[PDB]
From a paper:
McFKBP12 shares 58% and 65% sequence identity with hFKBP12 and AfFKBP12, respectively. To correlate sequence variations with structure and identify potential differences between McFKBP12 and other FKBP12 proteins, we attempted to crystallize McFKBP12 in its apo form. All attempts failed to yield protein crystals, hinting at potentially high conformational flexibility of McFKBP12. However, crystals were obtained with the FK506-bound form (2.5 Å, P3221), suggesting rigidification of McFKBP12 by FK506 binding. McFKBP12 shares the same fold as hFKBP12 and AfFKBP12 (Cα-RMSD [root mean square deviation], ∼0.5 Å) with a 5-stranded β-sheet wrapping around an α-helix. The three main loops defining the FK506-binding cavity (40’s, 50’s, and 80’s loops) adopt the same conformation as observed in apo and FK506-bound forms of other FKBP12 proteins. When bound to McFKBP12, FK506 also adopts the same conformation as when bound to other mammalian and fungal FKBP12 proteins (FK506 RMSD, ∼0.3 Å). Six hydrogen bonds (H-bonds) between FK506 and McFKBP12 are observed: 2 involving the backbone of residues Gln55 and Ile57 and 4 to the side chains of residues Tyr27, Asp38, and Tyr83. Interestingly, in McFKBP12 residue 88 is a Tyr, potentially sterically hindering the ternary complex formation with A. fumigatus calcineurin. AfFKBP12 and McFKBP12 also interact tightly with FK506 (KD, 4.7 ± 0.6 and 3.0 ± 0.7 nM, respectively).
Residue numbers in the entry: 1 to 108
The structure:
Amino acid sequence: MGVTVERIAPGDGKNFPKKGDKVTIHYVGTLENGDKFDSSRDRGSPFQCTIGVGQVIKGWDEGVTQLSVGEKARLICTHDYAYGERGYPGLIPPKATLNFEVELIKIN
Ligand SMILES: C=CC[C@@H]1/C=C(\C)C[C@H](C)C[C@H](OC)[C@H]2O[C@@](O)(C(=O)C(=O)N3CCCC[C@H]3C(=O)O[C@H](/C(C)=C/[C@@H]3CC[C@@H](O)[C@H](OC)C3)[C@H](C)[C@@H](O)CC1=O)[C@H](C)C[C@@H]2OC
């Protein structure tokens, strides 16, 4: 049903990213078969972006807002909350479900 949050280790229960917030977030991205396509942890570098304003995939906009600082989780994004029917040429096959193991490090 779109984006689903599989909770692994809990956040602080208080600080949740809101629309327009900057988040600092480690992620490991895998395709529906288990193969990694991207990883901020292999670059030793958490990613930073603005949540809820249309700049990341829908699964992150509707999914990262459900986490609190410190939390580990998996966002399971079906293709309509990711790269859709065409996919991402070279990287993401069409209609793919994507699986992001994420850790929310900080909100601003
Ligand atoms: C000049 C632009 C390059 C610029 C690249 C960076 C800043 C480096 C940054 C680590 C991205 C990665 O570079 C290693 C690499 O990350 C992926 O592997 C990936 O894990 C992914 O899915 N992520 C990254 C983590 C957040 C969720 C999602 C994303 O939303 O990413 C965003 C994304 C592509 C959203 C599109 C935007 C267009 C909409 O139409 C579409 O809507 C469906 C969704 C990224 C951050 C963009 O906002 C900014 C950029 O693209 C992509 C598979 C391909 C992407 O490289 C291109």
